[PDB]
Amino acid sequence: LYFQGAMGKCQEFTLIKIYVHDYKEFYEIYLRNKKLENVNENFFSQKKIILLASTLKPETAYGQNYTFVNPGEYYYVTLGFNKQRLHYGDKNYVNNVMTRDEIIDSCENVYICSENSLYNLAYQGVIPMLSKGSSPFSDLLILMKIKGEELVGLRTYSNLSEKKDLYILPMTTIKMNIATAIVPCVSSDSADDYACLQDIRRKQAYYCEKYNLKDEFLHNESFSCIQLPDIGDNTGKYFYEMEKISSYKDAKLQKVKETLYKKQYFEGTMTVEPYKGMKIYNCRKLVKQYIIKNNEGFLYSE
């Protein structure tokens, strides 16, 4: 199993907070998908609504121009904490067992993420577990369950990106059994991200009828965070062209990504301050320290 060209098995993921810009645009989606009580407009106004995006390349987050979900598959909406809460108590694992009401008080953030991640997130203290004190079995508080389709086109930002008008775009090759299954799009420094964007632009028309997207939302710049020795920056682009990729489904792409991930990791250098000219492995660590220190994300293992 691979993620962004690397073996998923081996590393910590970095989860980055991708904020919804307008809670009403999210609330609309909630009302429509309710059809298929105190969870009001007023509830979503008092909470930050966050997609937990997963990445093994947090050094490229400056270059985030979109955010990818799988449109065919289901995502889960829950309540969790702003910083990891490491209550142990009676148990050896982390467990913030709360009632429906206690959860609604203590959780300032509405998180959106894959089914795969939930129990992992709960055991790493990011979300509470639900209880009425009458079952030994675990439970989570799920506000809703929606297909990634429904999220597409939502205006979103991160606090690490250069630009703040990032949109949710559809990627069908996202794997629902790898971390949160929401991934930053960085089309400058990822061949897979560049290829997905090209397809979507190449079919402006199709994607705009099927989803809630507009032509004008589909041309955001992605600042290129990584240089290679003789290639220069914009490596996502350069390897897409040199390996004649025609589609983000091209079966050939899986190995391009792997070749790119490694070449960046050992031979690449950083293009942004305060990391200019640094090696990826040194910068990556600094960015994760920054992300954790400012509560813009979480460390995540599964």
Task: Please describe what this structure looks like.
- The chain is an alpha+beta fold.
- It has one domain.
- The chain is 31% helix and 22% strand.
- The chain contains ten helices and 16 strands.
- Strands 3, 4, 5, 6, 8, 10, 11, 12, 13 and 16 form a ten-stranded mixed beta sheet that branches. Strands 1-2 form a two-stranded antiparallel sheet.
- Strand 1 (2-3) and strand 2 (6-7) form a beta hairpin.
- Helix 6 packs across helix 8 (235-242).
- It is globular, with a radius of gyration of 19 Å.
- This is leucine--tRNA ligase.
- Belongs to the class-I aminoacyl-tRNA synthetase family.
- The PDB classes it as ligase.
- The entry lists the keywords ligase, leucine-TRNA ligase (leurs) activity, ATP + L-leucine + TRNA(leucine) gives AMP + diphosphate + L-leucyl-TRNA(leucine), aminoacyl-TRNA synthetase, protein biosynthesis, novel boron inhibitors of leurs.
- The assembly is monomeric.
- Crystal structure of the P.knowlesi cytosolic leucyl-tRNA synthetase editing domain.
Beta-strand share of residues: 15-25%
Total helical segments: 10
What is the CA-CA span between the terminal residues?
13 Å
Q: What's the helix-strand series?
A: EEEHHEEEEHEHEEHEEEHHEHHEHE
Gyration radius from CA atoms, angstroms: 19 Å
Q: Count all strands and give the number.
A: 16
Assign the structural class, choosing from mainly alpha, mainly beta, alpha/beta, alpha+beta, or little secondary structure: alpha+beta
Assign a percent range to the helix content. Answer: 25-40%
Shape field: globular
**Count of domain modules:** 1
Biggest sheet record: 10 strands, mixed
